[PDB]
Amino acid sequence: MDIDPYKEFGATVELLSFLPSDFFPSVRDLLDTAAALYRDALESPEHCSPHHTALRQAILCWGDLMTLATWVGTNDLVVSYVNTNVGLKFRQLLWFHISCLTFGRETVLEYLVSFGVWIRTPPAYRPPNAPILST
Amino acid sequence: MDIDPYKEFGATVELLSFLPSDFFPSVRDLLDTAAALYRDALESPEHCSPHHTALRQAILCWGDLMTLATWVGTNLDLVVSYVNTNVGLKFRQLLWFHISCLTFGRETVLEYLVSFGVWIRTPPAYRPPNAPILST
Amino acid sequence: MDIDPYKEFGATVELLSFLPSDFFPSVRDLLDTAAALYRDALESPEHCSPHHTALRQAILCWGDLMTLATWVGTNLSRDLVVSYVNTNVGLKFRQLLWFHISCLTFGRETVLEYLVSFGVWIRTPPAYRPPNAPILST
Amino acid sequence: MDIDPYKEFGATVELLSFLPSDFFPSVRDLLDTAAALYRDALESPEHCSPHHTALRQAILCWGDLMTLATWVGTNLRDLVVSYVNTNVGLKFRQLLWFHISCLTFGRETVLEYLVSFGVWIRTPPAYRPPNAPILST
Amino acid sequence: MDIDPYKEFGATVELLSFLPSDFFPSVRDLLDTAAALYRDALESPEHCSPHHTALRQAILCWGDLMTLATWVGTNLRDLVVSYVNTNVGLKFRQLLWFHISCLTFGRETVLEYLVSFGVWIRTPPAYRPPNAPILST
Amino acid sequence: MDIDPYKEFGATVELLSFLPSDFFPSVRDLLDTAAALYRDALESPEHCSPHHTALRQAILCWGDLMTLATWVGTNLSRDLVVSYVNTNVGLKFRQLLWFHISCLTFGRETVLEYLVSFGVWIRTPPAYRPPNAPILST
């Protein structure tokens, strides 16, 4: 029953939980990114790639969690849960789905492998720069 | 922001709000239905269709909501009979428009809503005595 | 002056009196049919038809009569006043809402042939007539 | 059911907000105008253009307003009478005026009537000459 | 940083000194004009001409003036309020009016509007007929 | 109405919020950049670009806001008033000054690709990110 959300795009959840927790940018920083960058691509009535569609259904859900966040939190422990346990795994989608349209789906799948050998190296002789998706 | 989930799939949220809210099948039936017809299709690494990848980014979201709902249900009328009132209606039709789509074709599903749409508002003294169904 | 709303489109004002009062769907049940599957052809910058001329002016009246009728219950025996909008003046207006919507799903050649056949099923009294209603199709 | 009255015919409903509510003639004048101008072009069993197709729909939707205000005025008062003249339903005074010139002077010149008016109606009366452009013929 | 507002578009800033400061309409009218005229031609993701390219830059530079005068008026008064209407910053009332007619009537006819006005505005009122040339359509 | 100053030129108002407050040069340090090497393309009788449309109207605002702000210190707690022009309302306005100047030295195709790459360097928190700043070049 556990349906992989990521098997369409090379990675798995543990190619995606491969990275640490707070390394992913915040949802307010990311939901304001796709509306900034890919505004006309999302509003368009054409499915212009299969990679665009899975980015769309997440944007309903963060609006759907806020339909559950405020409307339950109005009637100091729920707010801590929306950022850490379901929220962090929900925060994964926005970085991974935007970036494969940023610089390439195969680019982001190659982004992870160099990142782990950078970051699972302990701070004794970790190189000073991190690999970043470049121009 | 203003991203409705149907501009790429022919309908609107207005087009699916034409049906009465009770007509949609209940969610735990569709969980088996989504588990029925696409076991080796949803897990398969080939993305089948844009209709197919959206259900896979629907069952992950519906699992996240009831994750919190039972989680907040075990620490505090309040939750499950509460969340299934105002926004628990649309995640039925988010699923049902997708699970029924590529079983018969998107044009089959949209013309179904035309024919079943005109069938339900006309009074029963003059409509066809049955509703149409999914044929082919 | 004496201008019937159907003289161009092959009907008359008298042709729709064969249609009984319970044939048509309810107004609020029918007003969203233009909102159902006619959203493009009502809001395209080009008219898709002469039918979408009048149908675009169909809702334009209902956006004023009920706007008046909402104003009635604020400032005006009022139990019959707002219901009369739904009773007799609207019964002509419900005919206006259905017929233009009836075209684009079926064809105006279809609906004009439909009301001829529907007429004889209700011109004929219920002493000897088939109770199965003639449905609308191709 | 947000359908603008004019998405099909050039102007938009924001564009008719240039016109003040003191510019339009009385509604009984335009019916007598449209009867005198296009008696043959409204009882006609055919349309040549959509511009005099919607004209009968306003006439069909003005007759019920005369029907209702007389019905609600002789069965119920001057507030409703002073309503129907200068209500939110000045729209039918608006709707009748726009479709007269589109048939009589083309859809093109009606937009050539209004934009010139918007410059003339907003410019202050210190330099605003009493020679407002009435329509070319 | 002496950049004239108009070296690119025909007229010069000395040429707009013909126009008196009582001729221009109120600034709230032109925003409602430009929204009604060119809602589609300002939210557009492309430019067809530079004349409605600078129109959004005035709208971007009028919103801060509404922002600042409200901010400096609700945190500090009527002198600053009577400033921003008839200050040295009537320039944004000037800048908005010039770019409306260039898109709506061509860059050519805007110069065909102003030179005729300069003859009419300087000729004394003994022979100065109240029929000042409003724009051709 | 709601008109962002970048909808044509491939950016948004939200895209520049990734740029921090200390990225941009100081206003008086940047206002002469148009006076530096753009004197011809600001004062040519023909516009050299759609970029020099807005950039010619860039200084036109700063010739009025500071003209207002100079008038503030004459006739108007005034320690914060003129500084607020340099603090928050100007921070949008400093973005307007740099971006059009950013084009003609580099290309608008260059700068739009620049802010995408600059965004991820500041979307990423300083727990794990390279401290060498991505400079602007070809």
From Swiss-Prot, chain A:
Keyword set includes RNA-binding: yes
What does the record give under GO molecular function? Answer: DNA binding; identical protein binding; RNA binding; structural molecule activity
The organism's superkingdom is given as: Viruses
Can you cite an annotated GO cellular component?
A: T=4 icosahedral viral capsid
> Where does the record say this protein resides?
Virion; Host cytoplasm
UniProt modification remark: Phosphorylated by host SRPK1, SRPK2, and maybe protein kinase C or GAPDH. Phosphorylation is critical for pregenomic RNA packaging. Protein kinase C phosphorylation is stimulated by HBx protein and may play a role in transport of the viral genome to the nucleus at the late step during the viral replication cycle.
Q: Which UniProt keywords apply?
A: Capsid protein, Cytoplasmic inwards viral transport, DNA-binding, Host cytoplasm, Host-virus interaction, Microtubular inwards viral transport, Phosphoprotein, Repeat, RNA-binding, T=4 icosahedral capsid protein, Viral penetration into host nucleus, Virion, Virus entry into host cell
Resulting phenotype, F90L: Enhances capsid assembly
Question: Which cysteine residues pair off into disulfide bonds?
Answer: none
Q: Name one GO biological process term.
A: symbiont entry into host cell
Assembly mode: Homodimerizes, then multimerizes. Interacts with cytosol exposed regions of viral L glycoprotein present in the reticulum-to-Golgi compartment. Interacts with human FLNB. Phosphorylated form interacts with host importin alpha; this interaction depends on the exposure of the NLS, which itself depends upon genome maturation and/or phosphorylation of the capsid protein. Interacts with host NUP153.
Give the protein's biological function: Self assembles to form an icosahedral capsid. Most capsids appear to be large particles with an icosahedral symmetry of T=4 and consist of 240 copies of capsid protein, though a fraction forms smaller T=3 particles consisting of 180 capsid proteins. Entering capsids are transported along microtubules to the nucleus. Phosphorylation of the capsid is thought to induce exposure of nuclear localization signal in the C-terminal portion of the capsid protein that allows binding to the nuclear pore complex via the importin (karyopherin-) alpha and beta.
The family annotation for this protein states: Belongs to the orthohepadnavirus core antigen family.
The protein in question is named Capsid protein
Q: Which residues of the full protein are shown?
A: 1 to 142 of 183
UniProtKB/Swiss-Prot annotation, chains D, E:
Question: How is this protein named in the record?
Answer: Capsid protein
Q: Which GO terms describe its molecular function?
A: DNA binding; identical protein binding; RNA binding; structural molecule activity
A single GO BP term for this record reads: symbiont entry into host cell
Resulting phenotype, F92L: Enhances capsid assembly
By sequence similarity, the record places it as follows: Belongs to the orthohepadnavirus core antigen family.
Which gene name belongs to this protein? C
PTM field: Phosphorylated by host SRPK1, SRPK2, and maybe protein kinase C or GAPDH. Phosphorylation is critical for pregenomic RNA packaging. Protein kinase C phosphorylation is stimulated by HBx protein and may play a role in transport of the viral genome to the nucleus at the late step during the viral replication cycle.
Where the shown chain sits in the full protein? 1 to 142 of 183
Keyword line: Capsid protein, Cytoplasmic inwards viral transport, DNA-binding, Host cytoplasm, Host-virus interaction, Microtubular inwards viral transport, Phosphoprotein, Repeat, RNA-binding, T=4 icosahedral capsid protein, Viral penetration into host nucleus, Virion, Virus entry into host cell
Species this protein is from: Hepatitis B virus genotype D subtype adw (isolate United Kingdom/adyw/1979) (HBV-D)
- State the oligomer form and interacting partners: Homodimerizes, then multimerizes. Interacts with cytosol exposed regions of viral L glycoprotein present in the reticulum-to-Golgi compartment. Interacts with human FLNB. Phosphorylated form interacts with host importin alpha; this interaction depends on the exposure of the NLS, which itself depends upon genome maturation and/or phosphorylation of the capsid protein. Interacts with host NUP153.
